[PDB]
Specification:
part of a larger assembly, 4 chains, four-stranded mixed sheet, binds a molecule of 2 linked components (NAG-NAG), binds 2-acetamido-2-deoxy-beta-D-glucopyranose
Chain lengths: 75, 216, 226, 49
């Protein structure tokens, strides 16, 4: 079950097409994680969900509501 | 500069050339050999954390609308060009050309490969052009680019009516401005010096390290 | 409504901290690196450093000075480099902490003591207020931030012609729900009827691109009409 | 470098994603917006002022 990547020979992991959020970094854009019965999978890193913006020269979006979110920063 | 070349030198192979006799002698010196190895790894892992901080500041990947009607402004140069293999915009390409052994040192590849980075700078560019600052605070909100620039004047104390009356003139100044960036980057490399020094100082530092092997 | 959103917001912070310790990793890392480095420092003492024995008393006891010197001098040089390395480890790590301390001090001043308009300097979204909390060798901030929630589509236009004189918003945006024209504040949808109290005239229609015909109301006129 | 990276990260957030009133923190003159461009081991900003 050998997979070849630019980082080096990767053995004992299953290569897959579909991408997910990076979990354990290998380098050269390959991230590996534990997934379903379960095994170790190596996949191309997913940069995030794609979202085109419905832009046009006379369309504007105005929020109608708000959420007061509290987040934590540690130093 | 954001990151430097992720370099790792195996402590043992460098000092001792796979000589068991040399290796055993080294074990007397205690944990020097493992500290020096681990410290360099700490630099390598930190190094990827830099590019995460600089670029991965956007939760989604926005994509510019197919039709490039931005009130007269011309982001054709800085927006990604699908024709080239790597999804890199024209200015991004000029930079990449301007910027220019087996003793146990290895160069680990970066985590975000250059194609992937160009994706974020595509996103951050697309978000700015179609959402102003809003996409930073939360969900991206489309605003026609003419007004978004008009807001930004209202930020710096110039009332809106200045821009709308002068929309045609501002566009031409902006488009010619981008054009001037190409030539300064296209012809003169002195501007891009700061990135080159990180490569030069680092690459030089290895040469001193390797040359030391040939010292009695 | 805000109070309920704020109060529930604090509640979530506890559970995120109460059950999951991954949040406090960054403080935890500083403790480990120092404690781990110190352990290495002490461990180096038991390394013979190319001498007959790591224990000083042995080479002290078993051998008298003339040969003891050459053995001890190896130990001293070995220990000294180990201590030299540890200090340089601390000094470099000391600089990193200070850069974090000044960053914290800057946040404490610009983010707690006052509202700061620097974007994403104080947690994602527009910033309202910050509360500080102490922590082992650290400070933990609660950033109370305002985030727009439910967007909505509206057709818009730069300005309105009324009498050939172009009208711009004093503040806010010109939005139409499809059949009527309103001016609303930028970040929240509370459309109001368009009046000269909301708009300031400039120039004439022709210059501005995209301007849309509509009616601008004048409060003074119906009062003089009456 | 990491000192430079944080400065870039601060610049990215306060200069690209938003307009900033800090003088000369985003190029000479009043600031309007910034565009980021990738570079080998670095980031290049276009400051529109
Ligand atoms: C703005 O959003 C809030 C959501 O936080 C809405 O408040 C909720 O309203 C529903 C009614 O359908 C209640 O069941 C929820 O309990 C409310 N949330 C809270 C936290 O009390 C609010 O109605 C929205 N405002 C408008 C004008 O749509
Ligand atoms: C934006 O500006 C670019 C200039 O870089 C325009 O692209 C040029 O267009 C002319 C004709 O319109 C061609 O002769 C050039 O070969 C083009 N250059 C490149 C590099 O593609 C582009 O047309 C402009 N876009 C708009 C909408 O005006
Ligand atoms: C756009 O908003 C306006 C103002 O709220 C709407 O016009 C009002 O519609 C109500 C019925 O819902 C009538 O009772 C009022 O008399 C109307 N006001 C005026 C000044 O005509 C309009 O219907 C809305 N249009 C859409 C498509 O939502
Ligand atoms: C807005 O209303 C004005 C009328 O006040 C329109 O102006 C007309 O434009 C046409 C096209 O040149 C002329 O033939 C007419 O003589 C103009 N009217 C007047 C009274 O001079 C204008 O076209 C309207 N525009 C929109 C977008 O509604
Ligand atoms: C990815 O998909 C292609 C066809 O689209 C398929 O041939 C290939 O085997 C897939 N890769 C893996 C790892 O299954
Ligand atoms: C606004 O219209 C676009 C048109 O494609 C749509 O995708 C978008 O969801 C609409 N906005 C909302 C809030 O529904
Ligand atoms: C907006 O774009 C449309 C294309 O659908 C065009 O017909 C119209 O003239 C444009 N108006 C402005 C003000 O740019």
């Amino acid at each position: 079950n050998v997979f070849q990547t630019r980082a080096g020979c990767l053995i004992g992991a299953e290569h897959v097409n579909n991408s997910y959020e990076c979990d354990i970094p290998i380098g050269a854009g390959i991230c590996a994680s534990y997934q379903t019965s379960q095994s170790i999978i190596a996949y191309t890193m997913s940069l995030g969900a794609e979202n085109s913006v419905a832009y046009s020269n006379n369309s504007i979006a105005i929020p109608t509501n708000f959420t007061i979110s509290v987040t934590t920063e540690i130093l | 500069p954001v990151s430097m070349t992720k370099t790792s030198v195996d402590c043992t192979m460098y000092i001792c050339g796979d000589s068991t006799e040399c290796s055993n002698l080294l074990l007397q010196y205690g944990s020097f050999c493992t500290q020096l190895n681990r410290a360099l790894t700490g630099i390598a892992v930190e190094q990827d954390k830099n590019t995460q901080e600089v670029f991965a500041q956007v939760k989604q990947i926005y994509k510019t609308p197919p039709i490039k009607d931005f009130g007269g402004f011309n982001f054709s140069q800085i927006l990604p060009d699908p024709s080239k293999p790597s999804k890199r915009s024209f200015i991004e390409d000029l930079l990449f050309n301007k910027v220019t052994k087996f003793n146990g040192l290895t160069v680990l590849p970066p985590l975000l490969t250059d194609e992937m980075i160009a994706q974020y700078t595509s996103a951050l560019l697309a978000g700015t052009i179609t959402s102003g600052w809003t996409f930073g605070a939360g969900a991206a909100l489309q605003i026609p680019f003419a007004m978004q620039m008009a807001y930004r004047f209202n930020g710096i104390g110039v009332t809106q009516n200045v821009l709308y009356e002068n929309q045609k003139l501002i566009a031409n100044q902006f488009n010619s401005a981008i054009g001037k960036i190409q030539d300064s980057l296209s012809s003169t490399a002195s501007a891009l010096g700061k990135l080159q020094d990180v490569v030069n100082q680092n690459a030089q530092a290895l040469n001193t390290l390797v040359k030391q092997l040939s010292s009695n | 409504l805000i109070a309920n959103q704020f109060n529930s917001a604090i509640g979530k912070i506890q559970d995120s901290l109460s059950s999951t310790a991954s949040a406090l990793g960054k403080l935890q890392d500083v403790v480990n690196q120092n404690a781990q480095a110190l352990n290495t420092l002490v461990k180096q003492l038991s390394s013979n450093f190319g001498a007959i024995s790591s224990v000083l008393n042995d080479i002290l006891s078993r051998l008298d000075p003339p040969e003891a010197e050459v053995q001890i001098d190896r130990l001293i040089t070995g220990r000294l480099q180990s201590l030299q390395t540890y200090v340089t480890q601390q000094l470099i790590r000391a600089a990193e902490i200070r850069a974090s301390a000044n960053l914290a001090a800057t946040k404490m001043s610009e983010c707690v003591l006052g509202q700061s308009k620097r974007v994403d300097f104080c947690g994602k979204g527009y910033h309202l207020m910050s509360f500080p909390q102490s922590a082992p060798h650290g400070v933990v901030f609660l950033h109370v931030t305002y985030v727009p929630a439910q967007e909505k589509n509206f057709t818009t236009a730069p300005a309105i012609c009324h009498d050939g004189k172009a009208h711009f918003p004093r503040e806010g945006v010109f939005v139409s729900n499809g059949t009527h024209w309103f001016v609303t504040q930028r970040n929240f949808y509370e459309p109001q009827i368009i009046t000269t109290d909301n708009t300031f005239v400039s120039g004439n229609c022709d210059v501005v691109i995209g301007i849309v015909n509509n009616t601008v109301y004048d409060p003074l006129q119906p009062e003089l009409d009456s």
